[PDB]
A paper describes a structure:
The Eph (erythropoietin-producing hepatocyte) transmembrane receptor tyrosine kinase superfamily, with its first member identified years ago, contains 14 members in mammals and is the largest among all receptor tyrosine kinase families. However, the cytoplasmic portion of all 14 Eph receptors are highly similar, each containing a membrane-juxtaposing kinase domain, a protein-binding SAM domain immediately followed by a short carboxyl tail PDZ domain-binding motif (PBM). In this study, we performed systematic biochemical and structural studies of the bindings of three SAM domains, two from previously identified Eph-binding proteins (SHIP2 and Odin) and one from a new Eph-binding protein discovered in this study (SAMD5), to the SAM domains from every Eph receptor. Our study reveals that the Eph SAM domains have exquisitely specific target SAM domain-binding properties, although their overall SAM-SAM heterodimer formation modes are very similar.
Surprisingly, although the amino acid sequence of SAMD5 SAM can be aligned well (the key binding residues in particular) with the SAM domain sequences of SHIP2 and Odin (top), SAMD5 bound to EphA5-8 and EphB1-4 SAM domains with strong affinities but only weakly to EphA1/2 SAM domains. To delineate the mechanism governing the Eph/SAMD5 interaction, we solved the EphA5/SAMD5 SAM–SAM complex crystal structure at the resolution of 1.9 Å. Similar to that of EphA2/SHIP2 or EphA6/Odin, EphA5 SAM also uses its End-Helix to interact with the Mid-Loop SAMD5 SAM. The most prominent difference is that the EphA5/SAMD5 SAM-SAM does not contain the π-π stacking observed in the EphA2/SHIP2 and EphA6/Odin complexes. Instead, the EphA5/SAMD5 SAM-SAM is essentially completely mediated by charge–charge and hydrogen bonding interactions. Similar to what we observed in the EphA2/SHIP2 and EphA6/Odin structures, Gly853A5 at the beginning of α5 in EphA5 SAM is also critical for its binding to SAMD5 SAM. The backbone amine of Gly853A5 forms a strong hydrogen bond with Tyr27SAMD5 sidechain hydroxyl group. This hydrogen bond brings the α2-α3 loop of SAMD5 very close to α5 of EphA5, and the site has no room to accommodate any residues with side chains, further highlighting the importance of a Gly at this position in the Eph SAM domains. To our surprise, substitution of Tyr27SAMD5 with Phe completely eliminated SAMD5’s binding to EphA5, indicating the critical role of the Gly853A5-Tyr27SAMD5 hydrogen binding in addition to their steric role. Our crystal structure of the EphA5/SAMD5 complex can explain why SAMD5 does not bind to EphA1-4, EphA10, and EphB6.
Residue numbers in the entry:
A (entry chain B): 1 to 64
B (entry chain A): 804 to 872
The structure:
Amino acid sequence: MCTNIVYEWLKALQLPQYAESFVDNGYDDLEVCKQIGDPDLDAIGVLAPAHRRRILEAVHRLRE
Amino acid sequence: GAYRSVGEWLEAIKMGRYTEIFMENGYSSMDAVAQVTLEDLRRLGVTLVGHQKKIMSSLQEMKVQMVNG
C-alpha cells in the first residue's frame, strides 16, 4: 500500500537493481540502511566497485 | 509454531546460513528460539544488522500469531 522506501532510495541512486536483495537481507528501511558497511554489501551481493562506492557515499549522507 | 525445526524456520526467512550456529550453541528447537534476544544473536555471531532485524522481526511475528490464535 506504499512504495518500499529502500526501493525508492536505490531508485534515487540509480541502483534499483539491488532493492530486492537489500530487503531480503533485512535492509528494509533507511534506519537499517544507515548502518551499512562493507560486510553488509558483501552479504547483499553488491560487488561492482563503483556501485559499492555510490551506496557507501549515500549511506554517509543518510547519517547527516 | 508452524515450523518443524530451527533450520526450516531459518530457511523460510532466507537466514539458513545460521542454522549450524544455532544448533551448535544450544538454540536447537523452536521453543529455545522464542526466548532469543538481540544480545543472544550478537553472541552467536549474527553481527549483520539486517540479518538481526530479519530474525528478531520473525520471532516477533511468530509470537503475534500465537497470542492472537
